[PDB]
Amino acid sequence: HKDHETVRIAVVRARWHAEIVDACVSAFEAAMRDIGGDRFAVDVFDVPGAYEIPLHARTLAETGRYGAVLGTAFVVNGGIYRHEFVASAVINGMMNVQLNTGVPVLSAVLTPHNYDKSKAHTLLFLALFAVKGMEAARACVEILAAREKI
Amino acid sequence: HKDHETVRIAVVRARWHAEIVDACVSAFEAAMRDIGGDRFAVDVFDVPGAYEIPLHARTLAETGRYGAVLGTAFVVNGGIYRHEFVASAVINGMMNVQLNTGVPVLSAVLTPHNYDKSKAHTLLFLALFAVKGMEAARACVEILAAREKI
Amino acid sequence: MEELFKKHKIVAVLRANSVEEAIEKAVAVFAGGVHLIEITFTVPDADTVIKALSVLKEKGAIIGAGTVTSVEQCRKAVESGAEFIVSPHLDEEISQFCKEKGVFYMPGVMTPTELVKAMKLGHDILKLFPGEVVGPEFVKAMKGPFPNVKFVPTGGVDLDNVCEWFDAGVLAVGVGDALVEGDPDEVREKAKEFVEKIRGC
Amino acid sequence: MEELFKKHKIVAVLRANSVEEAIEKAVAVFAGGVHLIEITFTVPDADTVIKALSVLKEKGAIIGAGTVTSVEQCRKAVESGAEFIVSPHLDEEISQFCKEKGVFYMPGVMTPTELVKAMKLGHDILKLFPGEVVGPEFVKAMKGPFPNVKFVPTGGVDLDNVCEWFDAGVLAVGVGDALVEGDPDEVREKAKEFVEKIRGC
Amino acid sequence: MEELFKKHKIVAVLRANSVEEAIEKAVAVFAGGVHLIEITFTVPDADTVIKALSVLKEKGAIIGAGTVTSVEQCRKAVESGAEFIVSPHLDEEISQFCKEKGVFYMPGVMTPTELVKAMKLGHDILKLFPGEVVGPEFVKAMKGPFPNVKFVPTGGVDLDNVCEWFDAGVLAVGVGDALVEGDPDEVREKAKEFVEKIRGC
């Protein structure tokens, strides 16, 4: 038939610092509508944190119900322990998932240099996440379409 | 039949700094009862240290007897050698296990910025571990249930 | 709680914007010598804090919760293991709830009328609040008509006047920011200063 | 009244032995920058004053009445156009009357128990009285257990400490003799001084 | 916008070479107390900045865009959620576009003729620009023939003379580099200084 099918996109988002993580997701969804032109539709799923994204995203990617998956989280230094170990496992995890499933996984998992949850920091990240959301939507449409050209 | 089966959860815990690691495990078990409502049950296994968790947890995950596995340990800088090499291998190990078995593995392996086993430090970590236990129980129920929705 | 107040003579009052913050202060305070710790119920996720700090009970800590204004809040404080409940004001519903649950309750008062209503309900230990308004003078004046009433003032208490509060006849003093604010290491030193100052008077 | 208290941060409290005196002060106060004016109900023929000063409403004045101890007094304050009623104490009959009439009511309190009774009846803005006894310390202490309660103290307020009252968290301050006593020209200058001092803090 | 200009008395004018830079300044400025923020439309990818900063609207920020010279630019500023549009000069096409869209428009003027053309088109709030040429003297002089015209000067405004601009009768002042240039922490301190200086005059 003629390909007029909606491309399904999944977003998997961490519940920590949801006010910030969701800023990205909301911006992403709006941008997908602005760019996609209803050629794309997005479903959103929650995950406890960044750590579980690679399995949740994969379970979903291997289902064949999505053209692409966006993982997102705000991973910060809590002042107690080193967060780098998880952040490393997660970025490598998502990289491995797209290489194992054939479904591109975009990363919107941020590891800031500094975040003390100050008034200014909270506000800064809400805005920066909204920007990343918009960038991810553009990346989504362009990469999905680009792989279709091979 | 009707699904009224108990979800089996395994916990694999390091014997180093057991007073702290067990604080997490005890809190986890209590929280699983509080949240699970007897829909879940948890078995606990000991492991010498964090290093062996990925194989023990996997042996168990590949047995099919558990819906999910929680690994836990307190990995610290002994002042003698760098502990980061193991911590890296372990977090990557657990990430690889859940991606190889299809059984989510939760991480409650902590790598603190500082721990000199002072009075205050010991007490701090006993309480922080109890908190992580409670968080893990919530994550467990929610992620297990979330993957069931795909 | 009756033995404990007499034994320690001080209650730390914690306030925090997070679970981790509440824990660090509780530990600095406890590690520094203060065993009776009141967690304001208004700490975001106070319920988590109250339950997580139950680990310190095996080290001799007594964990309870303050700023309780309702029975629903009490129920959660009890659910998490609070040893005691402290309210900003005498409240009959809180008191009856607490009696049924077996959790120690300390109502707040400022005047003889309020004091008496609490006595008539069986509460001989009162939170005096704000201590900033009534002072050690109130505590002493009350001993005339109410020789059997014990107070634990909150506010108006620092290491500079803690001995005045004791000369006046308080049972114990609650201590706020003077004891619990600052870097956890500063907090631990402050706890030692309060314990030692009370020890000496 | 909620917007108005936030907007102006000051209420003049008038006392007079005559209608003409009350008018001259109201005008000096208003002309000098204070828009929220409370007329004590005890001014001889206060009803005349309240109604006569309704002319200032078209200039942006808000006219209400204070020292209300009963519903009969409230009825007359309402009859004359009072925007708001302020009582020396929380009074359930005044409160219910005011709710039925749609006139803003501000009850008086001094302790957490009284504060809470008012909260339970829907009054989150309280008259704090005497402010001379409780001070800015009370206002600040109350924010812990009652973070959503606003105060408008009367007494204990002058231009010397008005900023302390604001640092403590008051909504607005009522001002008595410090603002309204003296020659109407002196009164007008005092009103400017209070407005400017609050403007700066 | 009419209420907002009266309420805040200051508009930050942002300039940046990037999206991240514009955000950091907007946040430092906002966090420091300035709620009305104008984003020059010439910021590379200003459209991204305008839309990304829409998150601050729920915190009380008002986000608009400046240096608009055409209707195509206006359309994008509107598309991204600009609350208002400010042009370097009165422009009839911008004005008509803005009226149709319902976005507040503030035209720029320097002389009575330009002022009047704007009045005849329904614009009683004008951008005065450069304020560096005309000064507070122009603003005051204009009140004679144009008592109903409000100005928001840009340029010639610093914390050293902001009160002169207000004595002259401006509605609000726009502030450029004096407010927004420097390290985001320096910017936040400058915002506090401007707000406090205006607060006092």
Numbering used by the authors:
A (entry chain B), B (entry chain B): 6 to 155
C (entry chain A), D (entry chain A), E (entry chain A): 691 to 891
What does the paper say about this structure?
To generate building blocks capable of displaying native-like Env trimers, we computationally docked the crystal structure of BG505 SOSIP.66434 to a set of trimeric NP components with exterior-facing N termini. An early screen for the expression of several of our designed nanoparticle components fused to BG505 SOSIP revealed that the trimeric component of the recently described NP I53-5030, designated I53-50A, secreted at higher levels than any other scaffold when fused to BG505 SOSIP. To further assess assembly efficiency and structural integrity, we performed single-particle cryo-EM analysis on BG505 SOSIP-I53-50NPs. After several rounds of two-dimensional (2D) and three-dimensional (3D) classification, a final set of ~3600 projections was retained and reconstructed with icosahedral symmetry to a global resolution of ~4.5 Å as determined by Fourier shell correlation. However, because of flexibility in the linker between the two domains, the SOSIP trimers are poorly resolved; they appear only as diffuse densities surrounding the well-resolved I53-50NP core. Two discrete unfolding events were apparent in the thermal melting profiles for BG505 SOSIP-I53-50NPs; the SOSIP trimer components unfolded at a lower temperature than the I53-50NP core (72.5 vs. 82.0 °C, respectively). Specifically, the stoichiometric values for PGT145, PGT151, and 3BNC117 Fabs, close to 1, 2, and 3 per trimer, respectively, confirmed that the SOSIP-I53-50NPs present 20 antigenically intact trimers per particle. Finally, we also observed a markedly lower binding of BG505 SOSIP-I53-50NP than their corresponding trimers to BG505-specific mAbs targeting the immunodominant 241/289 glycan hole (RM19P, RM19A1, RM20F; Cottrell et al., manuscription in preparation) and trimer base (12N). Thus, bNAb epitopes on the SOSIP-I53-50NPs from the apex down to the CD4bs are highly accessible for multivalent interactions, but this is not the case for some epitopes further down the trimer near gp41 and epitopes at the trimer base.
